[PDB]
Design a protein around this nucleic acid. Structure first.
Ligand SMILES: [Zn+2]
Lengths: 129, 153, 148, 341
RNA sequence: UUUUU
């Protein structure tokens, strides 16, 4: 059964880039997916993506530029304190300033350094680098 | 016309041919004996080497290959498979030690750094056309000394 | 004319009295994987290992190997181009990195060699007074550098 | 004698003289040489064959070491420059070289190079005569200038080697270590002169050493310095003083050219199509296929061996796959391409 | 050893 739509989406992105595809289709959609892709877009790893509604959960079609070295989810969504963030960044990233750990914090979905600047914490969604 | 019948026979024969490799290929799949596969490879490697099917490696290609081996170190005993055999006395046996040794040498192969073919169309058109008998045979004489396919035959 | 190379003035039997902090270290191509693979940052795994400021150095030959690797090792390529990593020019035709590294340490006894290749490590081991850095387990390890 | 002519194509399987046989008889020479000239028309290779053919017809103008030091090899080194694996080209080297010698200086050149003069004068006269019969029967005053010829091209050299093959198809020998490595162990210390070879069509003896034949002392191959070629052509076999059979080598031949030449003879057979990665029976039609085969060259009571695999064209004549044409590796690699397209 | 169109 479908347990994590976000994991399936990110796996689709990884397969798409690995095969060199410029565009990839993701189904089903979810607000977390759009927020995650918006963070990725802001960091520039991903280009334009467009939502297609069908009167069901919907679909995404995302343009790809080959700047994504890896992207993945962290399941289960461990609670993360501010002290614990650097531990996660050390584990999941080849270097701290290469990549971002995306946290769903009380102020929204956002990358780790933004969370440090805002002094907020929460659960961990995944990583991109 | 009748040419379609010739066409049908043509596809029929091809469909026969594809099944045959399918039966043969399908049966060869089930045989997964290490000895049988081992012999088949060695015959195959000889044929490739004798026929020179594999293109020679340019010096650049060797450098790329040597680049990967150094840059990874995939062919040493620190690999998962090799380390497991070493630490549990599996390499005392000769066959597994050979499977280890072939791996190591494969890695070592990558680590290595007066003035004095156009095949002859010797068919009859290639000949020099020289130009020069029965009465001589008359002298030679002076020496002295499908049916039945469908009807009764 | 016969040649008997003069042993370096930086050496007293087997201790190099010249290598001192901040250390200059030459980076081998294979080092980058076992750094990336172990999630060990290059600059600071060195500081944690040596407890000093370390100046990594990438030569043209080791660099020349890296782009030849291709897309699979892009991350290694990018980390090699981190501006904190200085570059060393080379004036020898060959691109074989192992020979180039062995020559440079032969020339001047001021470099640490960061590598995990057994063959290269043995060659450096024969040369006296060359601290040899490697990555194992979780972090970097230095063998012939007693100031530690 | 009958079997030899059949190999040369002079006689058919019914022992009836072929058209080639009729043409061959027009020449004053042995059938081996006549076949050589029969195929020589390509690429102006005719003068070179005529030079060689006359030389081998008359015998060696060379004086050997036993009958006789620095000067000797100096002359030998000059004439072995064309090829380091052919004694035939040395004869071509000497014979052609003499055409550039001014008439007054032939004798001095002759003594300086340890050459048997009377054989050469007869060689020169026959090259004229064979140059006469060719021109008269193909279309005739022949001058000494007409005998003058320039150095062969590298292509001509390879082509010319295949000319010698056609007249000596049955006199090919292989290095014994190839067929029977257990019996013929060649070391880096083994002398070239003692490297065994096995003639084609040689009688199978219970002991295989009896079929070994070794290089004659007079061959340049003894001074070659590297391993002798895979296959070799010989003129004749002589019993050495050590009860060791010695062959008078002609020249080397590569396997695939050998197969092409033996294709028209009775000396070549074809294995079943090979299978595996790379080698695949490409099927154009139910009566067409391109596939790799192993040519088995030589006629189980004799010694023949298998050649390197070759890409070939097959067409089903009356149910038996017959070889139409040989195919290069690139030709085969393309062919599998279009079907996938 | 001979020797041939
Ligand atoms: Zn260099």
């Amino acid at each position: 059964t479908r347990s994590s739509v976000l994991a399936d989406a990110l796996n689709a992105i990884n397969n798409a880039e690995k095969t060199g595809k410029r565009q990839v289709l993701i189904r089903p959609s979810s607000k977390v997916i759009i927020k995650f892709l918006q963070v990725m877009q802001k960091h520039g790893y991903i280009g334009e993506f467009e939502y297609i509604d069908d009167h069901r959960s919907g679909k995404i079609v995302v343009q790809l530029n080959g700047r994504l070295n890896k992207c993945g989810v962290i399941s289960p969504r461990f609670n993360v304190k501010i002290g614990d963030i650097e531990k996660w960044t050390a584990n999941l990233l080849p270097a701290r300033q290469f990549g971002y750990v995306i946290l769903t914090t009380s102020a929204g979905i956002m990358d780790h350094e933004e969370a440090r600047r805002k002094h907020v914490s929460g659960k961990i969604l995944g990583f991109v680098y | 016309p009748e040419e379609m019948r010739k066409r049908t026979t043509e596809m029929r024969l091809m469909r026969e041919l594809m099944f045959r490799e399918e039966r043969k290929a399908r049966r060869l799949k089930k045989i997964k004996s290490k000895t049988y596969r081992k012999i088949k490879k060695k015959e195959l490697m000889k044929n490739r080497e004798l026929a020179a099917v594999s293109s020679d490696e340019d010096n650049e290609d060797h450098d790329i290959a040597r680049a990967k081996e150094r840059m990874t170190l995939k062919h040493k005993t620190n690999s998962k498979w090799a380390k497991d055999m070493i630490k549990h006395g599996m390499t005392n046996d000769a066959e597994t030690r050979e499977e280890m040794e072939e791996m190591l040498r494969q890695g070592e192969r990558l680590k290595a750094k007066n003035p004095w073919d156009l095949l002859l169309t010797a068919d009859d058109s290639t000949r020099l056309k020289i130009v020069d008998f029965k009465q001589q045979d008359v002298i030679a004489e002076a020496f002295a000394g499908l049916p039945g396919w469908g009807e009764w035959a | 004319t016969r040649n008997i190379p003069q042993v370096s003035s930086a050496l007293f039997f087997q201790y190099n009295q010249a290598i001192k902090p901040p250390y200059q270290v030459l980076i081998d191509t294979n080092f980058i994987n076992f750094s990336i693979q172990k999630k060990v940052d290059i600059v600071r795994g060195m500081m944690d290992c040596l407890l000093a400021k370390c100046n990594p150095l990438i030569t043209d030959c080791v660099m020349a190997e890296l782009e030849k690797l291709g897309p699979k090792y892009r991350i290694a390529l990018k980390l090699a181009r981190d501006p904190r990593i200085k570059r060393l020019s080379c004036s020898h035709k060959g691109t074989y990195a192992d020979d180039c590294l062995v020559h440079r340490v032969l020339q001047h006894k001021c470099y640490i060699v960061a590598t995990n290749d057994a063959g290269l490590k043995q060659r450096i081991r024969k040369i006296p007074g060359i601290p040899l850095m490697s990555v194992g387990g979780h972090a970097y390890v230095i063998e012939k550098l007693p100031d530690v | 004698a009958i079997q030899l002519l059949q190999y040369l194509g002079a006689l058919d399987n019914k022992e009836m003289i072929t058209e080639d046989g009729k043409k061959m008889s027009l020449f004053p020479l042995s059938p081996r040489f006549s076949k050589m000239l029969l195929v020589s028309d390509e690429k102006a290779c005719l003068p070179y064959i005529v030079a060689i053919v006359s030389a081998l017809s008359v015998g060696d103008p060379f004086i050997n070491e036993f009958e006789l030091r620095s000067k000797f090899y100096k002359s030998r080194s000059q004439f072995s420059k064309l090829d380091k694996f052919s004694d035939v080209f040395r004869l071509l080297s000497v014979v052609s070289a003499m055409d550039y010698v001014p008439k007054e200086q032939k004798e001095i050149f002759m003594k300086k190079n340890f050459l048997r003069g009377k054989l050469m004068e007869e060689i020169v006269k026959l090259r004229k005569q064979l140059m006469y019969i060719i021109k008269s029967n193909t279309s005739v005053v022949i001058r000494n200038e007409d005998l003058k010829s320039d150095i062969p091209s590298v292509i001509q050299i390879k082509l010319l080697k295949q000319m010698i093959c056609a007249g000596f198809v049955d006199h090919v020998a292989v290095r014994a270590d190839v067929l029977f490595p257990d019996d013929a162990k060649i070391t880096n210390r083994t002398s070239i002169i003692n490297i065994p070879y096995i003639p084609v069509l040689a009688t199978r003896t219970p002991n295989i050493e009896d079929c070994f034949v070794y290089i004659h002392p007079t061959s340049i191959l003894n001074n070659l310095g590297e391993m002798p070629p895979k296959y070799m052509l010989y003129y004749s076999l002589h019993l050495g003083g050590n009860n060791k059979t010695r062959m008078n080598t002609l020249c080397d031949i590569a396997s695939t050219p050998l197969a092409n030449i033996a294709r028209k003879g009775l000396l070549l057979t074809y294995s079943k199509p090979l299978t595996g990665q790379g080698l695949k029976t490409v099927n154009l039609s139910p009566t067409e296929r391109y596939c790799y085969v192993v040519p088995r060259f030589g006629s189980d009571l004799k010694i023949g061996w298998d050649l390197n695999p070759i890409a070939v064209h097959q067409k089903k004549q009356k149910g038996q796959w017959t070889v139409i044409k040989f195919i290069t590796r690139k030709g085969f690699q393309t062919i599998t391409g279009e079907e996938k397209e």
